Paper text:
Synpcc7942_2462 from the cyanobacteria Synechococcus elongatus PCC 7942 encodes a putative sugar kinase (SePSK), and this kinase contains 426 amino acids. The At2g21370 gene product from Arabidopsis thaliana, xylulose kinase-1 (AtXK-1), whose mature form contains 436 amino acids, is located in the chloroplast (ChloroP 1.1 Server).
Our SePSK structure shows that the Asp8 residue forms strong hydrogen bond with RBL2. To further verified this result, we measured the binding affinity for D-ribulose of both wild type (WT) and D8A mutant of SePSK using a surface plasmon resonance method. The results showed that the affinity of D8A-SePSK with D-ribulose is weaker than that of WT with a reduction of approx. two third.
Author numbering: 2 to 420
The structure:
């Protein structure tokens, strides 16, 4: 099977078509402008540009397509899918009373956030008088795949979570469905299942097979986890980026109020995780990237530095332990910048260690091994510190592109995530 993944991120989009029988692939990209008066136009146009860059011989062989988009970027559209107002982006918060959402979702549901899709929908309900029942709210991924299969009000249970979906009971609440917002909600499917064939006109225009199937999508974060290929409870992916992001596959759903930990359904399993404010940004505050290698190769991880840093880039921590007034702790300073860097790496290591331990203590499946992504993944000193602290196998993730994760989704769905 040849499959196509399309991944829409915060600053651009990437398409990867993969032939999984020959292990062959092609990857194309588009970069978003940093300003627009019509972002939906930008995204749709990007979709066509991506398709157009894929070689015609690849296009004629693609039989499944899936799309991931940024979590919490949503559009308010009419019955035809035409946006009726500017999108509300993933990072935009709405000034609403979360109490107004209390009867529509469980106690500490993840949708109870000023930046959630549900909050944005209610916000639109405040700004408009009453929202016409024939309208619809669509996540970025939803809207984009709609461009390919034509079926309105269709989403997946990843994107839908922040809209108020409860994947533990595979439903929206009866209270939400019967409310004024109910008519605008999508029908929610499992990521990777076929929603419908490609639109005939789109197939002919782009030289795709008219029997090509468009699948339910996912989020960009989740697609990045799918890229790793990990599918056994206890397997995790650490993203050593500007911030440290942990994702852990678990037999059981876990969550935590103060730290905002929650879980996505992933087949018969659950994907939990957390994001610290600590990360590579802290390192960049003291060392140019060229200097980090020069110094790293001078560190012997087998001997302790004696330093006990908490490597925040600024005030406040959210995970593993929430403290809005948590201070960066970078004292004392050694004379040697090698030793200072070692202390920083030890602190970041402690953040990862404590993170997975916390997740386990919340009930997640005990860590079995770690796949590493991001800028810090190729740092072997840091990897050694992490192995020593955590005591499970750690390696660089084979693949880290959201588009490749989404290609795998298109091709195999979530079948691997069952016993």
């Amino acid at each position: 099977v040849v499959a196509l993944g399309l991944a829409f991120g915060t600053s651009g989009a990437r398409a990867i078509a993969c032939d999984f029988d020959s292990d062959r692939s092609v990857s194309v990209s588009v970069t978003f402008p940093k300003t627009s008066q019509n972002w939906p136009q930008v995204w749709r146009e990007a979709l066509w540009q991506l398709l157009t860059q894929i070689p015609a011989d690849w296009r004629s062989r693609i039989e499944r397509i899936a799309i991931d988009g940024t979590s919490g970027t949503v559009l308010l559209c009419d019955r035809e899918g035409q946006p009726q107002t500017e999108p509300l982006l993933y990072n935009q918060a709405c000034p609403i009373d979360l109490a107004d959402l209390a009867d529509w979702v469980p106690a500490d549901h993840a949708a109870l956030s000023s930046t959630s899709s549900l909050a944005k929908l209610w916000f639109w309900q405040q700004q408009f008088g009453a929202l016409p029942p024939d309208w619809q709210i669509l996540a970025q991924a939803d809207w984009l795949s709609l461009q390919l299969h034509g079926c309105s009000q269709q989403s997946d249970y990843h994107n839908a979570l922040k809209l108020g979906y409860s994947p533990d009971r595979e439903r929206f609440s009866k209270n939400l469905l019967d409310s004024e917002l109910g008519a605008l909600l999508p029908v929610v499917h499992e990521p990777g299942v076929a929603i419908g064939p490609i639109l005939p006109a789109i197939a002919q225009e782009f030289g795709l097979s008219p029997d090509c199937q468009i699948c339910a999508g996912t989020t960009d974060s989740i697609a990045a986890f799918l890229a790793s290929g990990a599918h056994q409870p206890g397997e995790a992916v650490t993203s050593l980026g500007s911030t440290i992001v942990l994702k852990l596959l678990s037999q059981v759903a876990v969550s935590d109020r103060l730290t905002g930990v929650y879980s996505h359904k992933l087949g018969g399993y659950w994907l939990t995780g957390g994001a610290s404010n600590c990360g590579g940004a802290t390192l960049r505050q003291f060392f140019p990237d060229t200097e980090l290698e020069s110094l790293s190769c001078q560190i012997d991880p087998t001997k302790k530095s004696g330093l006990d840093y908490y490597p925040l880039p600024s005030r406040g921590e959210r995970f593993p332990i929430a403290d809005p007034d948590r201070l960066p702790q970078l004292e004392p300073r050694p004379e040697n910048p090698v030793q200072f860097l070692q202390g920083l790496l030890e602190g970041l290591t402690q953040v990862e260690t404590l993170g997975y331990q916390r997740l386990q203590d919340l009930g997640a499946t005990p860590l079995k091994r770690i796949w590493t992504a991001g800028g810090g993944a190729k740092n072997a000193v840091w990897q050694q510190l992490r192995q020593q602290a955590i005591g499970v196998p750690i390696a660089i993730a084979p693949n880290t592109e959201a588009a490749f994760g989404t290609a795998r989704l298109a091709a195999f769905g979530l079948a691997a995530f069952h016993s």
